[PDB]
Design a protein around this ligand. Sequence first.
Ligand SMILES: *[C@@H]1O[C@H](CO)[C@@H](O)[C@H](O)[C@H]1NC(C)=O
Lengths: 50, 49
Amino acid sequence: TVPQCCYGFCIDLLIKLARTMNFTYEVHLVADGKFGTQERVNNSNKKEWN
Amino acid sequence: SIQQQATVMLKIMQDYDWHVFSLVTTIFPGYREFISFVKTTVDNSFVGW
Ligand SMILES: *[C@@H]1O[C@H](CO)[C@@H](O)[C@H](O)[C@H]1NC(C)=O
């Protein structure tokens, strides 16, 4: 969990939303590195999301 | 038990080319657990029909 630097348009919109609604930013990268939609788990255990 | 019996019934329904189903029960507390299990299995649609 090394600290990376991420920026762009989405972070600017997030900062604007935080300033308008007095929020705070806790940006953290996803460990999976994917959107993580519905998928079939191994051995048909259960239905969950990643 | 009821929990595994519902799974067996659904596995049987998988064959015979059956996909649409509807169940009718009573107000007994034991039957409500079966209904809840069926609803959870329906919500568990990642695999199966
Ligand atoms: C923003 O909301 C926080 C709520 O924790 C409040 O303490 C703060 O005074 C607010 N700032 C403004 C400018 O309204």
